[PDB]
């Protein structure tokens, strides 16, 4: 009562017992603390099977295995911004059928020597559809995503893809190779658009972080013997309630072949990977003239 409630943990659900001799709560000691979101839970695990019984959003419809094969990113469904979490006093627009629909980006071909690609969100959809037009016309943007990476192969084909969602996928460079150049990735590399960008070093994910630990991020496998597609339900993950859709990407979708594609000669050599994705609970605010970038 006699102290300012201005610590970094006010508003949390954790009760902290602390020692403070000053006016401010942040001056106090760290003290004591008086399914699981991180394991890429399924829709059945999160109990969201009712919203998943038919993946039809807007005016689009995809078909896949239900519930168990629907990865909800961090166990949280996309939602509109709550009244307390939002800061902008302007009321947002909710098109909800012209922006919350499945958009099909491109048809990148999986090869035996394929290294992998990444797609930045919502950079992939900035110049596509009513969602793209709302992204250019509005300063503020907020949406979840339902990304459905599709890769059909016969039962004689083999291989696996780590279809993963890396939030705030900052791209690093080779720094001239020797590491003493301080180069920075260009706009076509940081924001490659709907066409995506092929990974130069998928082992370090072009950021100095191993792909072996990419599974701590929301992810799903496209092991060809088991499933032919991966559906990841990504919520809006940002330090802010809203953000610009043009100069900040909330997350990068990593589609990397961990197990290489392999088949004997006579089967179809064209094994394409299709990125179909739907914004969920899309919000736009701060309306002005449309700007591409």
């Amino acid at each position: 009562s006699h102290e300012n409630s201005n610590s970094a943990t006010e508003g949390s659900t954790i009760n902290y017992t602390t020692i403070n001799y000053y006016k401010d709560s942040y001056a106090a000691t760290a003290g004591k603390q008086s399914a699981a979101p991180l394991k890429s839970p399924s829709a059945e695990a999160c109990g969201y099977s009712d919203r998943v019984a038919q993946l039809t959003i807007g005016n689009s419809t995809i078909t896949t295995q239900a519930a168990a094969n629907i990865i909800v990113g961090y166990g949280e469904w996309p939602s509109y911004c709550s009244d307390d979490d939002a800061t902008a006093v302007d009321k947002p627009t909710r098109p909800d059928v012209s922006v919350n629909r499945f958009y099909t980006l491109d048809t990148k071909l999986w090869e035996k020597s394929s290294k992998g690609w990444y797609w930045k969100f919502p950079d992939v959809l900035t110049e596509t559809g009513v969602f793209g037009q709302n992204a250019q016309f509005h300063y503020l943007y907020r949406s979840g995503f339902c990304i459905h990476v599709q890769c059909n192969a016969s039962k004689f084909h083999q291989g696996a893809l780590l279809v993963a969602i890396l939030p705030e996928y900052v791209i690093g460079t080779v720094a001239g190779g020797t590491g003493t150049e301080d180069s920075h990735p260009p706009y076509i590399q940081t924001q490659p658009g709907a066409d995506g960008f092929e990974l130069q070093h998928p082992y370090v994910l072009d950021a100095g972080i191993p792909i072996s630990q990419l599974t701590v991020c929301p992810h799903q496998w496209i092991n060809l013997r088991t499933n032919n597609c991966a559906t990841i339900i990504v919520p809006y993950m940002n330090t802010l309630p809203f953000d610009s859709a043009l100069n900040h990407c909330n997350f990068g979708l990593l589609v990397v072949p961990i197990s290489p594609l392999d088949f004997d000669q006579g089967a179809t050599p064209v094994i394409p990977i299709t990125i179909t994705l739907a914004p969920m609970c899309s919000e736009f605010a701060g309306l002005r003239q449309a700007v591409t970038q």
């Binding site: 084909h157 089967a267 094994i271």
Partner: protein
Amino acid sequence: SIWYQTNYVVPIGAPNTAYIIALAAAQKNFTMKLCKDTSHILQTASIQ
């Protein structure tokens, strides 16, 4: 219009070309008005 989302992928031993049978219908909300002579087929000769 029908577009290839990814591809038509087949292994060794499967045919490289398949076919799709489009079957068109109407929903329960379908309704009709103003009965008229059909013009999809026109017999110009007399039936013997």
